[model samples]
Target: QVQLVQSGAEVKKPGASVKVSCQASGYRFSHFTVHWVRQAPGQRFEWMGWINPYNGNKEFSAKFQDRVTFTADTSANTAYMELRSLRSADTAVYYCARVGEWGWDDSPYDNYYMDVWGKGTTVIVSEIVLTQAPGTLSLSPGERATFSCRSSHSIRSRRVAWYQHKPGQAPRLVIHGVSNRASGISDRFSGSGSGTDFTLTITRVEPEDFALYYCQVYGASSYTFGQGTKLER
Candidate 1:
C-alpha cells in the first residue's frame, strides 16, 4: 500500500514564496518518481513536472519552466516543490503523485501516469470557495460499462473527456468531448454528458478495459478532474 502524505495548506501574499511537501510512505521513496500537478481556482489540471528521487535530475512543463522548481530529499522520504514570486494567479491546489509503471522489464520507469495521489494542498492568495464518485465498479465481458462524474458546482462547458490509466503507465485518452474517440482509440470507448453531469461508456467491456477511469471537464481554461473510478472484477 503506497501512500503520499502531503503537507498542509498555505496562505500567502504576492511576491512571497512557498514550499509544498509530499512525504512518501510504504515504499522505497528513491525507487519511484514523484510528479507535481496544479489546479488553479476553477481551472483545469496542469502537469508541473517531476523529479528523480534517486538522482537530482528534474523535468518541467514549458509553462512551469523557470517558474517552479522540484526537489526531493530521499533521506527524509519526501519530495518538495518551491514556487517563487507567487502571485494571485498562483493560488490553487497542488498535488504530489507517484508515477505508475508495469515493470522494469519494459523500462516501466520511462512512462508516467499518476497512480497514487495526495489529497491536495490548497494555497490561498486572495479569496476563494473550493470543492469522485464510485470507488469501484464490476462488469462482465461484452457488458456496457458506464461511469459518471458529478461536479459540486455547475460546470459551464460540456467539453468532457475520458481517460483510462493502467497500474504503471500514463493515462490514455479514450474519448474526448461528447463522442469523439481519440486517434487509435477503440470504437468501443465513447463519451456523453452535459453540464456538470457527465458519463463515459464502453460499448463492450473487455479484459483490457478493467482499469482506472477518470472524467475531466475542459470547458473553462482551468480544468477539474474527477477523483477517479476503479473498474475491476
Candidate 2:
C-alpha cells in the first residue's frame, strides 16, 4: 500500500526556522504532486502551497507566498518544505500531501480532495505571519463551491470532508465523518466522493463559502490538504 512517512515533531522558539521531510513509498515518485499544509494549535486546517514532482513548479496560497518554500529529491522519493523567518504564529502541524488523480485527462476540472497524508510535523513560531485562510462567504446569500483536502502520506483516508471558516474566526464544523453536514451549515453546500476521491460541492457558489474550502480524509495518516481552492471571482 502507498504511504507518506514524515519527519518527527519539532519544538522551536520564535524567529527560528525548521525543515520537515515527507517520504513517499510504494508508488512512482513522479506521478503526483506534493503539498504542504498547516493546522494551528487547537485550530482548523489551512492550505499553504504545493510542489509538483514531475516538474519543479510550485504554487502557494496568496497569504503564504513569501513565507514558504517547497522542494523535493526524486532520487530518494522525498519532499521537503522549509518555513523561513518563522514566528509563533507559524506554530502548527505541517503536513506533506500527495494528490490523487481522478483521471488521465490531465484537466483539473474534476480533481477532488487529498487522499494521502504524512505524520504531521509540528513547528513553533514566536512571530506572526500575518496569515489567514481568506475571507468567508455567506451561505444564506447562495455562495457555493467545492474545496479539496488530502494527505500525501497514507491512503487510509480514502474519503474527504468539508469545513466552513470565517475570517479571523475558528473553523466551523460544516461536514465530516461522512458527507453529512455538522450542524450550522446551510443546505446550499454538499459533499460527494469515494475511495481516494472526494469533494465539497456548494450548490450556488456563495460569497460566504469564500473564506477557504478544505477537504479532510479518514483513510490517510498525517492529516493533509490542498493549497486552498479560494472562491474568488
Candidate 3:
C-alpha cells in the first residue's frame, strides 16, 4: 500500500517563496524515483522533473531549470520542492509521483513511467482558455474515432501535442510537435491540423482504448489545454 501525502494548499504573495513536501510510505523510499508535475487551472499539465533519492541525482525540464529545487530525506522518506521567486501566475496543483515500469518489458518504452500519484498539493497562480469538442464519442472495435480541440483565436505559432488518460495510471503522451507520435504508440492514432483547430484520430479504435484524449498548445510564457474529448465504448 504505497502512499504519497503532500503538503496543504499554499497562498503566497507574488514575490513570496514556498516549499512543498511529499511524504512516501509503505515501501522503500529509495527504491523508486520521484517526479513533479503541475497544472494551471484549465491549462496544460507540465512535467517539471524527477529526483533519484537513493543517490541524490536530479533531472529537470529545461524551462524549470532555475525555477525550482528538489531534495529528499531518505531517512524520513519525504521529498521536498522549494520554488523561489513565485509570480502571481505560479498557481497550479503540484503532484509528486513514483516512477516504474508497465507491461512486460525492460525496454525504454515500457519503463520510466509514473505509477503512483500523490493526492496533490495546490499552489495559487493562474490564465486563459482552450476548448475541446465531441464531449463524448461512442463507437466499437474496428471503427474510427475522432475528436478535437480548438483555440479562442488563430494560433500564430502552434506547438500542439495530445495525450491519453487511462484509469489508475498516469496520463500518456501520444502525439507531440503537432503531428509526430510518441514511441510504442499504435500507428492507427494520428494528429493533424494547424492554427486553431486540431484533431486526434484513432482508426479502427481498439476495445481497450476507450478513454479520454486531450490536446495542448505551448506559448512563450505558459501553455494551454483542451477540455478533453471522451471516447467511449
Using lDDT as the measure, which candidate wins? 3
lDDT of 3 at 176: 60
**Model 3 backbone overlap count:** 2
Q: Where is the poorest 10-residue window by lDDT in model 2?
A: 127-136
Between candidates 2 and 3, the one scoring higher on lDDT is 3
- Ranking 1 against 2 by TM-score, winner: 1
Instruction: List TM-score per model, in order.
Output: 0.58, 0.56, 0.60
**C-alpha-based local distance difference test score of model 2:** 0.63
RMSD of 1: 10.7
> How many residue pairs clash in all the candidates, one count each?
6, 35, 2
lDDT (Cα atoms) of all candidates against the true structure: 0.72, 0.63, 0.75
In terms of TM-score, how similar is model 3 to the real structure?
0.60
Residue 225 lDDT, candidate 2, scale 0-100: 39
lDDT of 3 by residue, 89-132 (tens): 67888888776533353333232444567877788842446788
In model 3, the worst 10-residue window by lDDT is 102-111
What candidate 3 gets wrong by more than 4 Å, as runs, is: 101-104, 125-227, 230-233
Per-residue lDDT tens digits for candidate 1, residues 1-233, read 67788888899989888899999999989988787887786454566888888778787777778788898888899999998889998988888877554434323232354556777788988511112457689888888888887766665444556768664343566766545676677888878766557778888988888888877654212344676788996
